[PDB]
Amino acid sequence: YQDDAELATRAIPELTKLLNDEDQVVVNKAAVMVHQLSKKEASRHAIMRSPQMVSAIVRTMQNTNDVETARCTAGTLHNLSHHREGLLAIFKSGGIPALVKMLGSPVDSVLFYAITTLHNLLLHQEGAKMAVRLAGGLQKMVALLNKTNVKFLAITTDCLQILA
């Protein structure tokens, strides 16, 4: 740690611009990397300290058509959501409506990261309940209830008890 921290901070601006690229091969690779970075606490802290990086992850998650890119950027928000500062950064970045949109994904890992991140925001982040409602999150959550396994159902039922 601390070495790792500064290493990340140096790379973060360029990763940001690559994540924002128009070429989806480039986006994908930069997303894999950002996801791998989010696995170590030091560099996870440098990701969460960068509004630009957080906004690029949110925007990519939401606009992408590549399954793997949606997975890795959703996974990354998931990892940030384990920290109070991560939650706040997702929230200020517009992460909530992106995450609610990923509740329509036919992909299991993505649904998974989206519902758990939303759960962590609903539990711990002031302002999250209203912003999930504003994004239509109650209906999108209710649409999943007959469509998922009993573990997703349980988490989603809990998000709903938080919101109703």
């Binding site: 360029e14 690229d21 070429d23 480039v26 930069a30 990397m33």
Partner: peptide, 27 residues
Amino acid sequence: PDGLSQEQLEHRERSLQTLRDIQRMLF
């Protein structure tokens, strides 16, 4: 392949190289 123009193929290659540079720095 994706039927990129040469200008797109050049941008793809320079971006992937920088990514390899960053992957190297981050090991």
